[PDB]
């Protein structure tokens, strides 16, 4: 069983993750009748989706399978907290870990941890913000819902693409691939908000590899490989982007 | 997977979570210090 | 010749470029008598390398064909310039491109210009340093001499590493592969010299993508796929770190 | 391949070197404007 996994995540670094990624991208956004829903059937078998939870439960009314992937939800389901002095919680799943950031060195998974700058990126300046404050970190099982929410209210700031490797990002790859985080493709996000700055991330699977931001649309693909970043105002300003605790501000997707 | 990342001392997150909670939108996560 | 040019782009499109190194640097790397002479000799033969210019022309004298791909010149074969108001050129090869830096663009080849925060990794306090600037881009032939000299006295400040692909970095994708030098895994000196703050990068190719310098030695591999950072203090300090005109400060290899 | 960077305006380089010109180590690319 040890070594079974490990030829499970031998399995893992040989295929080829990005070619796949893209061919299953292919897949689930092309226009599919029976196929999807076939398709769509099959996976809500597997995984044990709650479709009395999605706003459209009918798995033929979805047309393409990205589509299905960011499911709105029935807004009456999920509801953000009242009280403002409290973070309300990111996006559907499990957490995976939590806890105070212990100067720079954030918790991966038991023996193993990871660079706040790393992380980011090399962006230092972003790093000395967060050195010695609080992290967590939610794992979106495919049976979960797949769009971003915010905590609490945010003003727009900074925005930074990172390309990088697709491993599957589940628990087992979690335990035995170093920085997986900060190897993985993944798009930061950084706000102020009423309780100092606050980060959020949102980092691709193998072939969930598709990330959207609601303000920009899709980010990646295409994976141009390199690293772009833009920068907002300081709020109330001309051309200045906020939202609010609980607003939708991105989702993943297939591709 | 998502990640998040706050200031030294303006948060604190629930105490009762740990690994392999159960992690849904509307819930609590984290209260101000204030 | 649109065959072969199509070809070319094709398999390099397409081939595990990754793996491809990794046979090369634990081949050229293993010890094997006459194979690695052998080798070394259809090398020589192929791309007409200069065998007389090396410290030590008897391609048998070469253990492994690292050694010899890394192997030292004849300190008299090339003489530096020693007017201190000069920048001695960094190594053996032949200029891609070169000039002004019109306002963070920096030409590739015609049709094509890079960031220069892109090239930087979006450390934009560096590329600051360098805006509205002059640059040289310089290739290493096979043929050429691997390894690479500073263009005047310097003190070391910051170390930037990226990882990133491999790709051929031949000319025929320097005019087809967008930001190139910016999407390669590559290495990022930063100097202090009389003439301002000079920068001075080290990028890998498809085989050749092993980079080492001589203070630190073999960066990669291995390729552990993210941006690390290191500094230094500003020269006559404990530890500090400064190197002469036209002194080896680094050098490719296969791995 | 490598990349030298420099100041805007405390470095001049050669103009007789363009596009494709032989570089060998020891001969110089540059000189300062002082």
Redesign the interface.
Known sequence: DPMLNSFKLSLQYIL?KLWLTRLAGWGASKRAGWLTKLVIDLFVKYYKVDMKEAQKPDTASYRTFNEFFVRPLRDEV????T?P???????????????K?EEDKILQAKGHN??????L?????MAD????????????SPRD?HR??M?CNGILREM?YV???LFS?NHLTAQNV??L???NERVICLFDT??????????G?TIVGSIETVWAGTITPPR????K?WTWPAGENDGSVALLK?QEMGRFKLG | TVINLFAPGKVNLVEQLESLSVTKIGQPLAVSTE
């Open positions: 080829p999920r509801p953000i907290d009280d002095n409290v973070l309300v919680m990111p996006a559907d799943g499990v957490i995976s870990q939590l806890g950031i990871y660079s706040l700058e790393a992380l990126a090399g962006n230092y300046l913000l967060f050195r010695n404050g609080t992290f967590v970190t939610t794992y979106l819902y971003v929410h905590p930074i390309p990088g490797d990002v170093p920085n985080f900060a190897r009423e309780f100092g700055p606050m980060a959020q991330i949102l980092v699977a141009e490989g390199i690293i970043r609980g």
